[PDB]
Amino acid sequence: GCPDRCEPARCPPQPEHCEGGRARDACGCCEVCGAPEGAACGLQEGPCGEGLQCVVPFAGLCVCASSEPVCGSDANTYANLCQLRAASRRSERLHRPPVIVLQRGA
Ligand SMILES: [Cl-]
Numbered sequence: 001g002c003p004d005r006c007e008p009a010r011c012p013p014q015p016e017h018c019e020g021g022r023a024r025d026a027c028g029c030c031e032v033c034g035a036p037e038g039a040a041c042g043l044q045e046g047p048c049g050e051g052l053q054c055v056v057p058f059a060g061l062c063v064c065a066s067s068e069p070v071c072g073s074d075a076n077t078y079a080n081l082c083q084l085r086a087a088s089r090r091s092e093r094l095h096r097p098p099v100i101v102l103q104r105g106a
């Protein structure tokens with residue numbers, strides 16, 4: 001049940017960082033925290049964060065829209081870019097800098 005036009009002055013204030021990254025609400029109006037990879041999404045559970053797609057049997061689960069390994073600014077290779085970005089947010093949460101992408105798996 002969405003109004004035909006987003007009402008921005010009604011949008012809730014947000015935390016500096018979100019566990020599963022950023023997203024929009026179901027009306028595509030306000031910025032909200034999105035569900036992380038492997039977390040429940042849809043209806044009550046809310047949207048997946050950036051780079052994640054809500055998948056359902058043909059409630060859902062968030063999966064990374066990309067599936068290829070990536071090498072970050074640390075030594076650690078990440079199973080996908082969603083996991084690299086989460087690690088980066090956790091690092092920023094505890095006041096460090098981000099984990100940036102170097103190449104792809106190597
Ligand atoms: Cl974020």
Ligand SMILES: [Cl-]
Nearest residue numbers: 053055056063
């Ligand atoms: Cl799928």
Ligand SMILES: [Cl-]
Nearest residue numbers: 053055056058
């Ligand atoms: Cl598919």
Ligand SMILES: [Cl-]
Nearest residue numbers: 053055064065
């Ligand atoms: Cl797909």
Ligand SMILES: [Cl-]
Nearest residue numbers: 021085088089
């Ligand atoms: Cl990020």
Ligand SMILES: [Cl-]
Nearest residue numbers: 017088089092
């Ligand atoms: Cl961030």
Ligand SMILES: [Pt+2]
Nearest residue numbers: 017021022089
């Ligand atoms: Pt972020």
Ligand SMILES: [Pt+2]
Nearest residue numbers: 053055063065
């Ligand atoms: Pt798919």
